[PDB]
Design a protein around this ligand. Structure first.
Ligand code: XWH
Ligand code: CL
Ligand code: NA
Ligand code: NA
Lengths: 306, 306
């Protein structure tokens, strides 16, 4: 029993973290096969950041301008190029610890583990969701750029996030490993803001199912509803629309717990309209939306990643 | 910015997890140098649950009764001995992945990371705290016994918990790595129940300091309190006593934020009286008690956001 915000074991990714220095700027890089990936803004001075021309800034750099340290061992950079907003540093040795991996771009609502890193050295791991407004509510300090986010699907590490910047509200923005930003953000020191966020409805439902599985049942009721009725309520309370595909995905959990999705939706409707009346669910006084249906199934079944 | 429940990177512990089988029972072992540590109750049978005599059960075992699998590899058991409630299996291979490590017994309120494992293979990582009633609120399924809790200071892993059992309330009990149980529990299936749990006051205070460091001041007030009046109030809310040790411990956070410890105590008293009135603190609608003063300093900036 029990249900905790759980990250993937981070060992396979720790073996890929390196330190990248260019001029006075040090940040983190991801070392896979013979390439080190890091944010292209590593080449900018402070005034460069105000309005960077990245191709122009890069041509002035030689390979020896990029100092890369894997542990206490230096790596020899033998080539460099840009792909969208990530710099690719070709090195002279393949990473002997390279895991089985893919680069994948995730959808808002999906979760991933972040390996927070400083000076190429992993410092912590935590679980995040890509918010509907394409930010993440991370925890990062200066020096954390180039830290990465990932899932493990069977034995393959799926890399989905590289950290680039913090927005004025304290939430965070970055790219996939092909350098495409999540959200309408640019890697430049200019005025940028998180858009208004919404709650991930299918994840809240998944977490209610997790609650029921763990004996927390007070919010269940006799009522059911319809998609169109419930989605009217969701829109009123700034919840994402629930689609038929979400209902299908929650299917397993509906049959296991005996609570149909629209039955559970009636529970969520009543919670949104009346609150919790002093009670908690899985130890929380707010409705939690950073567990996907797959997260709930996996934690409540013990899937492993050796 | 940001503030998240953050675990240590697990890789150094992942490289130590093995599977231990005895009879029909399989669970996890921790492989360090040439010793594998696991719960002694792996040698119990179905009729041994209530009043096992471990000394009598163990004397009947030979080294080849213990099967230890590390990855795809059988390790050879060349010796065994029992220390309190843990079994130490001597094996014919030192673990080449053994980190710098030590064994530390922790006090209630301390936090640590848990690497949940099944069949010797890691499933997930999360953060826990040793409750005042000597249980932990974990996420553990059948087969998770032998999973460990740890901190990582510099590059050194301090092992502080090994999981032995789940109590009827769904919380968890276990030992240090010397096999001594936390709290009054025993590795028997006789009726035992956790004491009434209380809130870790010094940790709530730490987390309020984290909220100020990250720029939130809404809950402060113009008042202060004596230590004794605070404790008289807080105990009525099932909060642990705050000692002068705790006040001393909070000195650094107090100095960083400019809020005297006893002034922060006055804020907490008011929060217990008023609730949050629809507001949140670091994203929670409840007061969080599983961040220590040491945790806050490690995760937060050294510069307060005024
Ligand atoms: F044997 C049972 F009854 F199937 C079983 C035991 C556990 C468990 C849960 C958490 N920690 C340790 C063990 N789950 N289920
Ligand atoms: Cl109805
Ligand atoms: Na219902
Ligand atoms: Na293993």
């Amino acid at each position: 029993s029990g249900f905790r915000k759980m990250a993937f074991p981070s060992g396979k990714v720790e073996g890929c973290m390196v330190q990248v220095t260019c001029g006075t700027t040090t940040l983190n890089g991801l070392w896979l096969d013979d390439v080190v990936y890091c944010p292209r803004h590593v080449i900018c001075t402070s005034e460069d950041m105000l309005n960077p021309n990245y191709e122009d800034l890069l041509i002035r750099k030689s390979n020896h301008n990029f100092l890369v340290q894997a542990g206490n061992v230096q790596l020899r950079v033998i080539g460099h190029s840009m792909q969208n907003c990530v710099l690719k540093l070709k090195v002279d040795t393949a990473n002997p610890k390279t895991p089985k991996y893919k680069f994948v771009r995730i959808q808002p609502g999906q979760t991933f583990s972040v390996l927070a890193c400083y000076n190429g050295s992993p410092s912590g791991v935590y679980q995040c969701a890509m918010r509907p407004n394409f930010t993440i509510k991370g925890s990062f300090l200066n020096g954390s750029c180039g830290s990465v986010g990932f899932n493990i699907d069977y034995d393959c590490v799926s890399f989905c996030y590289m950290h680039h910047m913090e927005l004025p509200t304290g939430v965070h923005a970055g790219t996939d490993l092909e350098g495409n930003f999540y959200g309408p953000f640019v890697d430049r020191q200019t005025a940028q803001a998180a858009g208004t966020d919404t709650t991930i409805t299918v994840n809240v439902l998944a977490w209610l199912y997790a609650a029921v599985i763990n004996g927390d049942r007070w919010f269940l009721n006799r009522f059911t509803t319809t998609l169109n009725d419930f989605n009217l309520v969701a829109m009123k309370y700034n919840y994402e629309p629930l689609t038929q595909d979400h209902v299908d995905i929650l299917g397993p959990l509906s049959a296991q717990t005996g609570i149909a999705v629209l039955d559970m939706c009636a529970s969520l409707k009543e919670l949104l309209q009346n609150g919790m009346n002093g009670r908690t669910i899985l130890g929380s006084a707010l409705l939690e939306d950073e567990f996907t249906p797959f997260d709930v199934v996996r934690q409540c079944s013990g899937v492993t990643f050796q």
